[PDB]
Coordinates of N, CA, C and O in Angstrom, one line a residue:
Chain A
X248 N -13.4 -23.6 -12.0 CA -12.9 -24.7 -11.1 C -12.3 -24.1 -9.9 O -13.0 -23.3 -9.2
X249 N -10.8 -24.5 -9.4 CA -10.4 -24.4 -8.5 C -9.6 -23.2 -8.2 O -9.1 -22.9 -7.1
X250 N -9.7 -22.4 -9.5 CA -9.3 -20.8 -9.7 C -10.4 -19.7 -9.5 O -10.1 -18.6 -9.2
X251 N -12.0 -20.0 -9.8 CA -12.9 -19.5 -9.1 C -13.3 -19.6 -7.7 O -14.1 -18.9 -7.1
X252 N -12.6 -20.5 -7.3 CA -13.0 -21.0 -5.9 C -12.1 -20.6 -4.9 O -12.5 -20.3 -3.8
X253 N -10.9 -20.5 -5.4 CA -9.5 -19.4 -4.8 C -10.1 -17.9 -4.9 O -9.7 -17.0 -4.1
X254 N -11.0 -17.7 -5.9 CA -11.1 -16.0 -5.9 C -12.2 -16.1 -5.2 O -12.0 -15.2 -4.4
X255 N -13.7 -16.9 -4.8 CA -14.2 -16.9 -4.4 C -13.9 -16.5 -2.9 O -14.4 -15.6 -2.3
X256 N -12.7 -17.4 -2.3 CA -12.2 -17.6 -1.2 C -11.5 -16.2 -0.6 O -11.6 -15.8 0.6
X257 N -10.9 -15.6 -1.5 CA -10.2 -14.7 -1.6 C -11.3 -13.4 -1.4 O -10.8 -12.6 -0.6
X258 N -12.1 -13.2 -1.7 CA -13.6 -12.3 -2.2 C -14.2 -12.4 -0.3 O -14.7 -11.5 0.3
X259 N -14.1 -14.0 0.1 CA -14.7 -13.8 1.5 C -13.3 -13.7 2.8 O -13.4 -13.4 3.9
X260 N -12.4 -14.0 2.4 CA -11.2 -13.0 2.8 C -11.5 -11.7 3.2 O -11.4 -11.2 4.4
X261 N -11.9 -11.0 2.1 CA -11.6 -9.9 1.7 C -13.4 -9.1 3.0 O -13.4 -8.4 4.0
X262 N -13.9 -9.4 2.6 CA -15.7 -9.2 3.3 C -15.1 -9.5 4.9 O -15.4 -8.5 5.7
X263 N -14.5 -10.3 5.3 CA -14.2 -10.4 6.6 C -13.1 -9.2 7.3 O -13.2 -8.4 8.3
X264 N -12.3 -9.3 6.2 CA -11.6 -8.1 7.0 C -11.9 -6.6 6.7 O -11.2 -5.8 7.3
X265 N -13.2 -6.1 5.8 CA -13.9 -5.2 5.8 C -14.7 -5.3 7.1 O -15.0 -4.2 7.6
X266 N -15.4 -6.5 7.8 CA -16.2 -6.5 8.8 C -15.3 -6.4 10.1 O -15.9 -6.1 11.1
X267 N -14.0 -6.6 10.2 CA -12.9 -6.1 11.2 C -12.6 -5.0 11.2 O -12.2 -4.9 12.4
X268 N -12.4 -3.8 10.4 CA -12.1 -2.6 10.0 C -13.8 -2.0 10.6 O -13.6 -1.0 11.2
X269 N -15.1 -2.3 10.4 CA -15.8 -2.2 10.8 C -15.6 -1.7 12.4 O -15.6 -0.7 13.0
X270 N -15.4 -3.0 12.8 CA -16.0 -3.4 14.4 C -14.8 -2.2 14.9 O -15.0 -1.5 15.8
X271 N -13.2 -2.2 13.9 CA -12.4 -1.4 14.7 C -12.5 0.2 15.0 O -12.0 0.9 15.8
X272 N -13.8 0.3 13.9 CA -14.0 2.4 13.6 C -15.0 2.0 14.8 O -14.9 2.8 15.7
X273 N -15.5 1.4 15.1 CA -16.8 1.4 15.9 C -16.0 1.7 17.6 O -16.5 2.5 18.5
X274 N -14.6 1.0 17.6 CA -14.1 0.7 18.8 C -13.1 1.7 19.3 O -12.4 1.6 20.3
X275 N -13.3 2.8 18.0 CA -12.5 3.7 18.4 C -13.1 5.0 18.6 O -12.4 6.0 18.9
X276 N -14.5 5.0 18.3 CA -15.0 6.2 18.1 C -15.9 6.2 20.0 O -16.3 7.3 20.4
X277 N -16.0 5.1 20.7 CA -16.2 4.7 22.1 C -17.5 3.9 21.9 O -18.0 3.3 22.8
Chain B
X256 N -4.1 -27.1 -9.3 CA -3.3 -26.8 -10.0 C -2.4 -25.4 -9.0 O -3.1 -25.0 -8.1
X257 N -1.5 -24.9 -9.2 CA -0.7 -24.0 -8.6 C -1.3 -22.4 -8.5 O -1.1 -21.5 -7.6
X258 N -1.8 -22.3 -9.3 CA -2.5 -20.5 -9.7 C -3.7 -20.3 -8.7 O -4.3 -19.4 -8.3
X259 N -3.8 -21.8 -8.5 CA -5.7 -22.3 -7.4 C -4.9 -22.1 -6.4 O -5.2 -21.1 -5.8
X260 N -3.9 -22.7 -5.8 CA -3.0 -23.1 -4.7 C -2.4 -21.7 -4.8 O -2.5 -21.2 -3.7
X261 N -2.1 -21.3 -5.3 CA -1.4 -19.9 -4.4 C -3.1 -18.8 -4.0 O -3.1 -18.4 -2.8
X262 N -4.1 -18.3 -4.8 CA -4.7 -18.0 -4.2 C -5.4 -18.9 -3.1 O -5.6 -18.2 -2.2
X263 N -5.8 -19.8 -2.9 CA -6.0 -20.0 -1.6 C -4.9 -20.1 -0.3 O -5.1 -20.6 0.8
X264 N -4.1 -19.8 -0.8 CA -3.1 -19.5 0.4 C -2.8 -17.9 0.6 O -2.3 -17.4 1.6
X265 N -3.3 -17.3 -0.6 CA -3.5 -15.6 -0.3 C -4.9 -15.6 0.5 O -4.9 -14.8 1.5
X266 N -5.8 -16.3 0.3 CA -6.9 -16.2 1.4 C -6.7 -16.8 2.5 O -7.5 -16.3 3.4
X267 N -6.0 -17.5 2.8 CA -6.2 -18.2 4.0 C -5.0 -16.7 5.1 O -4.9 -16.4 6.3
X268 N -4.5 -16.1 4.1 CA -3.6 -14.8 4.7 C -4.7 -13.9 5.5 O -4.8 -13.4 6.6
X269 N -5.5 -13.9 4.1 CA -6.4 -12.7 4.5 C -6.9 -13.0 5.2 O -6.7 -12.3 6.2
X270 N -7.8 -14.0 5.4 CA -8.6 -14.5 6.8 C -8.0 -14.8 8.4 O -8.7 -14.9 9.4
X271 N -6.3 -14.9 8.4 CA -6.0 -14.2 9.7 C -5.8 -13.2 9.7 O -6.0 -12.7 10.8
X272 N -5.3 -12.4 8.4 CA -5.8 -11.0 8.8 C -6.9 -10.4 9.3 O -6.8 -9.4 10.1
X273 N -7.9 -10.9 8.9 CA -9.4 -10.7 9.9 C -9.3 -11.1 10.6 O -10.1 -10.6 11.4
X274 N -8.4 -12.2 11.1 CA -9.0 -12.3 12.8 C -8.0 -11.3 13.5 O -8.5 -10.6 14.3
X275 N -6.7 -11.3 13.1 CA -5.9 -10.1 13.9 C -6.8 -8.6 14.1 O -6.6 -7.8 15.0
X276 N -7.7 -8.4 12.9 CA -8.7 -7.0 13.1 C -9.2 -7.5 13.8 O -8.8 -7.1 14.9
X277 N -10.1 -8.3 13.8 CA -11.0 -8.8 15.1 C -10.4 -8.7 16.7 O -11.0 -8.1 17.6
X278 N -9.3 -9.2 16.6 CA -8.9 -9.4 17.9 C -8.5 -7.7 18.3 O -8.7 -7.4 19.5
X279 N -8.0 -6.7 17.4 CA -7.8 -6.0 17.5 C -9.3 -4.9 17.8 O -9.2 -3.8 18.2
X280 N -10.3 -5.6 17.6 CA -11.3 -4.7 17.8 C -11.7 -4.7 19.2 O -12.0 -3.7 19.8
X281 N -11.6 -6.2 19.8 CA -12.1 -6.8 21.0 C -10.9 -6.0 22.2 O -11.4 -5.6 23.3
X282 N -9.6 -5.8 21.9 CA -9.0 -4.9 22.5 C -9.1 -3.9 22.6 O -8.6 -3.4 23.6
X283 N -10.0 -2.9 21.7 CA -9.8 -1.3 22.1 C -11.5 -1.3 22.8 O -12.0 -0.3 23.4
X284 N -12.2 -2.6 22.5 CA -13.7 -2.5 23.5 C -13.2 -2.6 24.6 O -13.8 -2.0 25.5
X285 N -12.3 -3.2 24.8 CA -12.3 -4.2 26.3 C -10.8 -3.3 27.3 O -10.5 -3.8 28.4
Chain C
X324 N 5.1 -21.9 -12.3 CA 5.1 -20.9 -12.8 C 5.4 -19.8 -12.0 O 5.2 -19.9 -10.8
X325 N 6.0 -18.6 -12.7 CA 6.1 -17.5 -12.1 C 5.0 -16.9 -11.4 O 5.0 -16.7 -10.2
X326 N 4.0 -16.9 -12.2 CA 2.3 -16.3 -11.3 C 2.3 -17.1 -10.3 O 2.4 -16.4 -9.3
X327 N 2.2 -18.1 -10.0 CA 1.9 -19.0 -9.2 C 3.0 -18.7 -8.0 O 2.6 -18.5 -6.9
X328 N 4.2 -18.7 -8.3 CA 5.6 -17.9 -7.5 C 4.6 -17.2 -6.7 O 4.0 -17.5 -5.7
X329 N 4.7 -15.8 -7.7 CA 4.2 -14.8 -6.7 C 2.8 -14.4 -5.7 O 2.5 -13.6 -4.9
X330 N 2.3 -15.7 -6.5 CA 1.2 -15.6 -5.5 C 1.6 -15.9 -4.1 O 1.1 -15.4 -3.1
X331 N 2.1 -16.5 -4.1 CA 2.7 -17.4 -2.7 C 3.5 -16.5 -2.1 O 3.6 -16.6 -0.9
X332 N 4.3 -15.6 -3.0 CA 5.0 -14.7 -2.0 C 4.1 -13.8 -0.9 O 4.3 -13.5 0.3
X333 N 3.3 -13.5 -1.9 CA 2.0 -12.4 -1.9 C 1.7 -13.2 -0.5 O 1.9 -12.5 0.5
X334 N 1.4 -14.3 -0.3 CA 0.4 -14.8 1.3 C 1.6 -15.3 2.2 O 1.4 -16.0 3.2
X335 N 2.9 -14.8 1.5 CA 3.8 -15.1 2.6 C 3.5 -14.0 3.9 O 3.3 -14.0 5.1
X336 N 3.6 -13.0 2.9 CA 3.7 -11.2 3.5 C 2.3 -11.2 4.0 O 2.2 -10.3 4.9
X337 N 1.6 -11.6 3.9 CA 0.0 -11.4 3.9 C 0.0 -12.1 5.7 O -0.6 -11.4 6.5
X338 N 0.8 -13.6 6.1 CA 0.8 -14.1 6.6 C 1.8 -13.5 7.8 O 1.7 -13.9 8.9
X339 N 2.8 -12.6 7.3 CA 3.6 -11.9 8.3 C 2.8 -10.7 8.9 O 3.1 -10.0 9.9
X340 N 1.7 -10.4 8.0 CA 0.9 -8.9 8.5 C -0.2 -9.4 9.6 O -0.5 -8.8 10.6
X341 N -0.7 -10.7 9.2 CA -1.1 -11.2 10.3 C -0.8 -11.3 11.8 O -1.4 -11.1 12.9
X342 N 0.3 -11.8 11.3 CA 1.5 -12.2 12.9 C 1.3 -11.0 13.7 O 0.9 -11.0 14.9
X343 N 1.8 -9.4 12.6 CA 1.8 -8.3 13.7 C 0.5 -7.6 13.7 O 0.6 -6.5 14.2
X344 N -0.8 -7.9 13.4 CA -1.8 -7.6 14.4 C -2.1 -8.7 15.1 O -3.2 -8.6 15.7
X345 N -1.4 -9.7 15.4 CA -2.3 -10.5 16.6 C -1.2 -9.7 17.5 O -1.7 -9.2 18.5
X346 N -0.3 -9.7 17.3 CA 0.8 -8.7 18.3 C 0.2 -7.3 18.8 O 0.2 -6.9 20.0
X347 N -0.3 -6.8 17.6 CA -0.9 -5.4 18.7 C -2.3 -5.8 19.6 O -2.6 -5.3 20.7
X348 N -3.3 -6.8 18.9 CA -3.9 -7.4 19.6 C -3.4 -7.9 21.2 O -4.2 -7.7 22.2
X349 N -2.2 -8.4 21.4 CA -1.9 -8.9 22.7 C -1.7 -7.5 23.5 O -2.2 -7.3 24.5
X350 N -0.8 -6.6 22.8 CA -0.5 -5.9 23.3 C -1.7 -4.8 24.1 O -1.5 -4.0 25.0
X351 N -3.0 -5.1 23.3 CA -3.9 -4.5 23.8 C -4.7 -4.6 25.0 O -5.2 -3.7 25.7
X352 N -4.5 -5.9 24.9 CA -5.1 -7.0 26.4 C -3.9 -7.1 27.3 O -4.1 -8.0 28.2
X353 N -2.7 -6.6 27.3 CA -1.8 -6.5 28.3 C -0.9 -8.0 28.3 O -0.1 -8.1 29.2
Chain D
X503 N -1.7 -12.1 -14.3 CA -0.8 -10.7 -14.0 C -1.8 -9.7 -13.5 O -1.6 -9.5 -12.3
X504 N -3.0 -8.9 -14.1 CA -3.5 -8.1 -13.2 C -4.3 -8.3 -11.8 O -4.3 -7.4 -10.9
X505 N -4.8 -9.5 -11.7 CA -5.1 -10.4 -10.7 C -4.3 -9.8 -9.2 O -4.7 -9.1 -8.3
X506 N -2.3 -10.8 -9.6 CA -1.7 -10.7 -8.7 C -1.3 -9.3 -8.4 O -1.0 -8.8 -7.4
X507 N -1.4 -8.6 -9.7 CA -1.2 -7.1 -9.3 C -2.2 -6.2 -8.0 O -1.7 -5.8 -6.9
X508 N -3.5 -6.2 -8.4 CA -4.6 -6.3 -7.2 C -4.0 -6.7 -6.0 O -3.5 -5.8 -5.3
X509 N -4.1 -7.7 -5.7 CA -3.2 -8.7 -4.6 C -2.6 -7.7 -4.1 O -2.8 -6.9 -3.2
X510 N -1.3 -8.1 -5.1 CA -0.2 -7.0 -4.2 C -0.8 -5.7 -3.6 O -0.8 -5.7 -2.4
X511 N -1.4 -4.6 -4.2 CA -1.5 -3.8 -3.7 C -2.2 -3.7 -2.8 O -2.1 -2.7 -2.1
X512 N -3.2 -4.9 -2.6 CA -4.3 -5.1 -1.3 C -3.1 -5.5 -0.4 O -3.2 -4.6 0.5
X513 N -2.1 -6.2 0.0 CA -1.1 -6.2 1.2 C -0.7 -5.0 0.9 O -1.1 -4.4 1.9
X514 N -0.1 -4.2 0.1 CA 0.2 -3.1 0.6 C -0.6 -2.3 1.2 O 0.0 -1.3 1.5
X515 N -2.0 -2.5 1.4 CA -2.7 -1.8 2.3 C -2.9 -1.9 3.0 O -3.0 -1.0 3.9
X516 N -2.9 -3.4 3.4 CA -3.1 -4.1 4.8 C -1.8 -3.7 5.5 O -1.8 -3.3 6.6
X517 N -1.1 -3.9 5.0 CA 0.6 -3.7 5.8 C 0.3 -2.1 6.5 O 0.5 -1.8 7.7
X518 N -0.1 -1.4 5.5 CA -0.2 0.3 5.8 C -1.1 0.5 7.1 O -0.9 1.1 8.2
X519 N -2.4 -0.5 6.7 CA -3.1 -0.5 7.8 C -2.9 -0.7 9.3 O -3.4 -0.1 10.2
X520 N -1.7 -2.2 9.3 CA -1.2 -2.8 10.7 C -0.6 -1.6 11.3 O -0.6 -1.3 12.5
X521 N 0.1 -0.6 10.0 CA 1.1 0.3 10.9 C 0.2 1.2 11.7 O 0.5 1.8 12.8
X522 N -0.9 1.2 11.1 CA -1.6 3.0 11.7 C -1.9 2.2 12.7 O -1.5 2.5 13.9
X523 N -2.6 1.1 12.4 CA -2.9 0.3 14.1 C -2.0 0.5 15.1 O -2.4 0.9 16.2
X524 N -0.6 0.1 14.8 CA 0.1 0.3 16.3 C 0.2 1.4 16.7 O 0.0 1.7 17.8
X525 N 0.7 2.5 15.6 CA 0.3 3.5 16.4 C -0.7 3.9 17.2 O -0.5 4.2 18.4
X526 N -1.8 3.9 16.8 CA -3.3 4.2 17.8 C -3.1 2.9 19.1 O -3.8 3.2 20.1
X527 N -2.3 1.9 19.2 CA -2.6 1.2 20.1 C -1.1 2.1 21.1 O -1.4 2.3 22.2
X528 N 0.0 2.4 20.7 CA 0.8 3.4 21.0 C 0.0 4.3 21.9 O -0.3 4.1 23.1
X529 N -0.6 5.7 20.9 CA -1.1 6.1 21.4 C -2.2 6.3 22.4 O -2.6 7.3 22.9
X530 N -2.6 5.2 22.8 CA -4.4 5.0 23.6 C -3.5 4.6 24.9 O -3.9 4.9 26.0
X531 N -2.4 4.0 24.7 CA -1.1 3.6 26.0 C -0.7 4.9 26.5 O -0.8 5.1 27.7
X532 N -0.3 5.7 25.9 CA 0.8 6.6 26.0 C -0.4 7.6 26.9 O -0.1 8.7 27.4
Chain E
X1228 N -9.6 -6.6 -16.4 CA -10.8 -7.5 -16.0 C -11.5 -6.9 -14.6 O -11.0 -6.3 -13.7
X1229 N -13.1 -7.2 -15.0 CA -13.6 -6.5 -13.9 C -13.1 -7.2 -12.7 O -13.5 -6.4 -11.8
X1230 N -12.5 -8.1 -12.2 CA -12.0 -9.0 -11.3 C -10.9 -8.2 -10.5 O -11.0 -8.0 -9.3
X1231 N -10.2 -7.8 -11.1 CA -8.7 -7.1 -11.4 C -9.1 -5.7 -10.8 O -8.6 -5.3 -9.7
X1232 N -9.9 -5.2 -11.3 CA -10.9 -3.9 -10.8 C -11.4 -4.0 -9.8 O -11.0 -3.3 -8.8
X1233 N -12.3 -4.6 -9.7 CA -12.4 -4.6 -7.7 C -11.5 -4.8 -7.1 O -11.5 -4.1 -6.1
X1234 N -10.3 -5.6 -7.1 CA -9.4 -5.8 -6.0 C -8.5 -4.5 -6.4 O -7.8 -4.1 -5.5
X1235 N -8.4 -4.0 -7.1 CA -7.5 -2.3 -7.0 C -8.0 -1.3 -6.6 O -7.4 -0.2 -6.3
X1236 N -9.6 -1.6 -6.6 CA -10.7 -0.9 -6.0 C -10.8 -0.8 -4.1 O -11.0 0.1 -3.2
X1237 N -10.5 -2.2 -4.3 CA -10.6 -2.9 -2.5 C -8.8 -2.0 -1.9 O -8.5 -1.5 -0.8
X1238 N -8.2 -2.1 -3.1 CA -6.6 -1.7 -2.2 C -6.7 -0.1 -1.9 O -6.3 0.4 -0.8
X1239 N -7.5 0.7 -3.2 CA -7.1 1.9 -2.9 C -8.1 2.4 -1.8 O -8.0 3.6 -1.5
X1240 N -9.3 1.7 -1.2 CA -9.9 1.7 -0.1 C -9.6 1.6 1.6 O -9.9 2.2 2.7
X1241 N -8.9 0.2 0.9 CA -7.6 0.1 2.3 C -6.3 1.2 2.4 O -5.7 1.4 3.5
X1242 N -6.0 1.6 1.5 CA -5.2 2.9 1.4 C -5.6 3.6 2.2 O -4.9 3.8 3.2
X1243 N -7.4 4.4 1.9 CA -7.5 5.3 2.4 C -7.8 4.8 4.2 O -7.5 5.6 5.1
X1244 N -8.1 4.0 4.3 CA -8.2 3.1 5.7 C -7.6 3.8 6.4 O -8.0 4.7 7.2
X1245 N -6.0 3.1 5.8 CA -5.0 3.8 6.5 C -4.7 5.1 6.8 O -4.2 5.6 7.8
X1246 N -5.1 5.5 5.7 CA -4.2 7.3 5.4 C -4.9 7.8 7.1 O -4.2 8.4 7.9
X1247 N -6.7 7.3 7.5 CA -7.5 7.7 8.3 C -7.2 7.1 9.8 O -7.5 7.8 10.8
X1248 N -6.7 6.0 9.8 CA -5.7 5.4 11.2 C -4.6 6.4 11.3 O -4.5 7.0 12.4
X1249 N -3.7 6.9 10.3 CA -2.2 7.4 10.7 C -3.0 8.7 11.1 O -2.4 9.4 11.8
X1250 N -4.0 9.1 10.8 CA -4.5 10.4 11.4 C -4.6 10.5 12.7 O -4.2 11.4 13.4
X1251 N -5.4 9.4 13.0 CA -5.7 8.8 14.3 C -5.0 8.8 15.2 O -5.1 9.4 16.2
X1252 N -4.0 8.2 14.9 CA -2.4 8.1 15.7 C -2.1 9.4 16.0 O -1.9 9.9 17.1
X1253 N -2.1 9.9 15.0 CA -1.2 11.3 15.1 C -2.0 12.3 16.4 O -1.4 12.8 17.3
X1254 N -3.5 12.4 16.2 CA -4.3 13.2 16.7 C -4.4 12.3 18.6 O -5.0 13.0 19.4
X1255 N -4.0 11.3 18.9 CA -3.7 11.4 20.0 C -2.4 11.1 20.8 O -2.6 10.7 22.0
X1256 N -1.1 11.3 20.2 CA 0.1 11.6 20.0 C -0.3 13.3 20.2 O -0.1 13.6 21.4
X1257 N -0.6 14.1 19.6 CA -0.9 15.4 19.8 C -1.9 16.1 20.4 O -1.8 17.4 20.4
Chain F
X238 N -19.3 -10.4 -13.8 CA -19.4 -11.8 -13.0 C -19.4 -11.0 -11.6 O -19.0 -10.0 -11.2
X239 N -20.4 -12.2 -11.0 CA -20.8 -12.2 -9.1 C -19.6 -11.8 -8.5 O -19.4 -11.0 -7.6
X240 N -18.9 -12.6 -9.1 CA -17.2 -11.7 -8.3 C -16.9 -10.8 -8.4 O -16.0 -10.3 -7.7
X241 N -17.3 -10.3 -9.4 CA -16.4 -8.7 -9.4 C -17.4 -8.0 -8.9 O -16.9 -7.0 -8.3
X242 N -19.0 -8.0 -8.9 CA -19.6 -7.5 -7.8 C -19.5 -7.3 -6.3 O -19.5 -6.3 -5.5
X243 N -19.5 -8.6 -6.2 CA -19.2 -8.7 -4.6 C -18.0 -7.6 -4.3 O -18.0 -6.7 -3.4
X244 N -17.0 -8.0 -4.9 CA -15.5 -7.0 -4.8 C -16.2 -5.5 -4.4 O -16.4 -5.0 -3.3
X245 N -16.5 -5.2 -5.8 CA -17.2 -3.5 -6.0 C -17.7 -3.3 -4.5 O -17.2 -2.3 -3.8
X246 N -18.6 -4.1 -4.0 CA -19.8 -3.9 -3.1 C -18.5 -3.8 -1.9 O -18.4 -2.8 -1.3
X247 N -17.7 -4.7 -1.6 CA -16.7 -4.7 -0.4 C -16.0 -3.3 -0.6 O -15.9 -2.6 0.4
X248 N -15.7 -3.1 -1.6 CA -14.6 -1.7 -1.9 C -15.8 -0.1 -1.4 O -15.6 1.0 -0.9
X249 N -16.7 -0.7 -1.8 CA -17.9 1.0 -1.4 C -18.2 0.8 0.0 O -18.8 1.8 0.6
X250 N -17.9 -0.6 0.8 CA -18.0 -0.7 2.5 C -16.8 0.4 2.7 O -16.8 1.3 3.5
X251 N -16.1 0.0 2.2 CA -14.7 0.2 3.0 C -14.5 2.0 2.8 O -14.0 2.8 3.7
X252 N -15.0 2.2 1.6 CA -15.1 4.0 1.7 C -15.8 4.3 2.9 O -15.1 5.0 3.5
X253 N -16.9 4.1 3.5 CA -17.8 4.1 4.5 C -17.0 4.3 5.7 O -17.1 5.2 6.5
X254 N -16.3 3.3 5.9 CA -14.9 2.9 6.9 C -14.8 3.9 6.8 O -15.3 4.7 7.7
X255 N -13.9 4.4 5.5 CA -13.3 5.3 5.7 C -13.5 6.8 5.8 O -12.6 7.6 6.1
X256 N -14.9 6.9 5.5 CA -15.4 8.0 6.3 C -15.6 8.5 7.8 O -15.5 9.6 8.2
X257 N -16.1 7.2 8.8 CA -15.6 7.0 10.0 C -14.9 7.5 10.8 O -15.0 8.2 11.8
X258 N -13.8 7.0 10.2 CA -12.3 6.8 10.8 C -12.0 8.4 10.6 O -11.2 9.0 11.4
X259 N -12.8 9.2 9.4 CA -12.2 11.0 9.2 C -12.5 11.2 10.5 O -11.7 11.5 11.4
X260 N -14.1 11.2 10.7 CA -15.0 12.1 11.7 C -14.4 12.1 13.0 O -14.4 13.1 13.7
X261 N -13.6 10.4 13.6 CA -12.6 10.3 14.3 C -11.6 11.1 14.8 O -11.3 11.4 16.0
X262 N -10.9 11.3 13.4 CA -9.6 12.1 13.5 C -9.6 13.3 14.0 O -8.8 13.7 14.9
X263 N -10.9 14.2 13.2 CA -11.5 15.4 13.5 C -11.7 15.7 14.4 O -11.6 16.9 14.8
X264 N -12.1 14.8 15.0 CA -13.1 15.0 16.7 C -11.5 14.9 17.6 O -11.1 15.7 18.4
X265 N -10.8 13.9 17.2 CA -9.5 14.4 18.2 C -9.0 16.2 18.3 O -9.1 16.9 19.3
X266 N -8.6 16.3 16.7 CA -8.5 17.5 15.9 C -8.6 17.7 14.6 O -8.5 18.9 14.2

């Protein structure tokens, strides 16, 4: 229920700020 | 229920923490 | 409940780590 | 309990993270 | 739980995140 | 469960990252 949907939520939390840590190696390497 | 309600308020953390990466990425491009 | 407590602590902090990258964010764009 | 344990240690990364950030945003100033 | 396991997974990742930012910092500080 | 996959799969991006950010370091010094 609303405890898979919190970890769900939590899980695309998580995927976004791996794709920010991304974009940041990208922005530091030029 | 509360255990649902606290993680989606741990996600909703994490996901401005992605945008603070984000924004932080857009600064070292720009 | 306690778990439920700490979760919320947990996205309190999560929510202040946010604050200070939108901060170096600004600081990046001047 | 291992759940929020996770958690926690995921802000303590993120927190670790924001710091190296200002530095590098320090540094790219300096 | 394998749940529990990825997110200690995800932390000691963002650990190393970091350990590789404070490097960053340092290396243009010096 | 799909969730603890997806996790796994986020956690082996982020080593990746973190290889990055070395070659980075290096290249300063």
């Amino acid at each position: 229920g609303e405890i898979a949907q919190g970890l769900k939520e939590i899980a695309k939390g998580l995927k976004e700020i791996a794709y920010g840590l991304k974009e940041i190696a990208q922005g530091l390497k030029g």
